Amino acid sequence: DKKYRWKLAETWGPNFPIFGDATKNMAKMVKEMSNGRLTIRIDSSNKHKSALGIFDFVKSGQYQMGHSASYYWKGKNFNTMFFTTVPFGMIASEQHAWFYYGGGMELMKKVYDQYGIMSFPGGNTGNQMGGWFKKEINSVEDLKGLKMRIPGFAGEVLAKLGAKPTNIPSGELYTALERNTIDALEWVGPSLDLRMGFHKIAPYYYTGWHEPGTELQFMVNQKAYNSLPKDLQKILTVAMKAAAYDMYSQSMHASGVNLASLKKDYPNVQMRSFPKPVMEAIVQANDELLEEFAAKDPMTAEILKSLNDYKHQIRAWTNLSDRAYLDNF
């Protein structure tokens, strides 16, 4: 008899490629698979006016669903950071193993259940670039007072070294950089960074370290989910899984297409790496901070131990398999 009409709030602006494709793809799959019994309207930042309001929208049930990143909610609960990615952590293929087979989904459920929110993988970008900089980073002294848009745990790490991170939303990044409200920023990589224009005013494009395997997030209000019949519940969860996996393939695809153009069409972009002493300080600050976060909360210790042990185990296989292969051929 009954049809369900839901709405999804997403962080991204309207027609945002790749990220906005995952939500649309998800919604279309649900509509088709349900023969119209479950339909999901997508509201982008231009509609709901709150790019970073998604967690509150879904908790309250004003929206039944959201699409965002777990690490945006660090202010609400620092344990939300670790389900997105961590500096020096796992690459995408590893993190998927961790989520679906290494206990990651279950840890995420223990963190989010307290809010009456269900959280699911919402798409991986793969390994992200270090970002866009107006001036080169030559020593740790260059990080002091550096105003940089960078989320999650890397933001905390750079702050420990004297930087001033912020979490300005995608639609506001260019203007903030143009005005020197930030001196640098990171977003994703070649899949998405070029159309956003940062290259016009920040010519140094740094390689990564901080976001090896960024997974986005779908969120679903538990009470809304419970109201669904069981077959539509499954349709929803399988659609989100499929859309999320495909987003990693799209991120890979787009990164290749866009890197090819970058190699040919941007004579003023200069790719850079952090000097060894800078990277050494960052690795250390990361280790120091992980140890500090782990000690102040047993749920944090549990999550970081799972990530750390799991990375140790799976990286050995990555090294024996794909890395050996990519290094050699």
Which residues sit in the known binding site for substrate? 128, 149, 186, 211
Inter-axis angle of helices 298-318 and 276-296, nearest 10:
140
12/1 Cα distance (integer angstroms): 34
Does the footprint of Cl ion cover residue 109 (CB under 5 A)?
Answer: no
63/43 Cα distance (integer angstroms): 9
By a kind-dependent CB cut-off of 5 to 8 A, residue 127 interacts, out of Ca ion, a copy of itself, Cl ion, none, with a copy of itself
Alpha helical stretches, state H, 184-229? 222-227
Residues 122-151 that bind Ca ion (CB under 5 A): 128
Known binding residues for Ca(2+) are: 128, 186-187, 211
Residues 34-73 that bind Ca ion (CB under 5 A): none
By a kind-dependent CB cut-off of 5 to 8 A, residue 268 interacts, out of Ca ion, Cl ion, a copy of itself, none, with none
Does the footprint of a copy of itself cover residue 277 (CB under 8 A)?
Answer: no
Tell me the closest approach of the beta carbon of residue 168 to a copy of itself, in angstroms: 24
Strand 4-10 relative to strand 65-68, pairing:
parallel
Q: Could you give the dihedral angle defined by the CA atoms of residues 98, 206, 81 and 126, in that order, rounded to the nearest 10 degrees?
A: -30
Residues 120-149 that bind Cl ion (CB under 5 A): none
Tell me the closest approach of the beta carbon of residue 169 to a copy of itself, in angstroms: 24
- Applying CB under 8 A, among 176, 245, 275, 297 the residue interacting with a copy of itself is 245
Number of residues that bind Ca ion (CB under 5 A): 3
b vs e for 167-198, b when ≥16 Cβ sit within 10 Å of the residue's Cβ? bbbbbebbebbeeeebbbbbbbbbbbbbebeb
Residues 117-146 that bind a copy of itself (CB under 8 A): 126-129
Residues 28-87 that bind Cl ion (CB under 5 A): 79
Q: Are 156 and 289 in contact (CB under 8 A)?
A: yes
Q: Are 126 and 245 in contact (CB under 8 A)?
A: no
111 vs 244 by CB, closer to Cl ion: 111
162/142 Cα distance (integer angstroms): 9
Give me the 90-129 binding string for Ca ion, x by CB under 5 A, dash otherwise: --------------------------------------x-
Other Cβ atoms less than 10 A from the Cβ of 240: the count is: 26
Q: Which helix (H) or strand (E) holds 277?
A: helix 276-296
Q: Could you give the dihedral angle defined by the CA atoms of residues 94, 98, 100 and 105, in that order, rounded to the nearest 10 degrees?
A: -140
Phi, psi for residue 242 in degrees, rounded to 5: -60, -45
Residues 34-63 that bind a copy of itself (CB under 8 A): 34-35
By a kind-dependent CB cut-off of 5 to 8 A, residue 239 interacts, out of Cl ion, a copy of itself, Ca ion, none, with a copy of itself
Sign (positive or negative) of CA dihedral 188, 194, 197, 199:
positive
Residues 158-187 that bind Ca ion (CB under 5 A): 186
Q: For the chain, first and last CA: distance in Å? A: 58
- Applying CB under 5 A, among 8, 18, 29, 111 the residue interacting with Cl ion is 111
- Applying CB under 5 A, among 238, 299, 320, 324 the residue interacting with Cl ion is 299
List of residues contacting Ca ion (CB under 5 A): 128, 186, 211
List of residues contacting Cl ion (CB under 5 A): 79, 111, 299
List of residues contacting a copy of itself (CB under 8 A): 29, 32-35, 88, 91-94, 96-97, 99-102, 126-129, 189-190, 207-209, 212, 229-231, 234-235, 238-239, 241-242, 245-246, 248-250, 252-257, 259-260, 263, 271, 273, 279, 283, 310, 313-314, 316-329
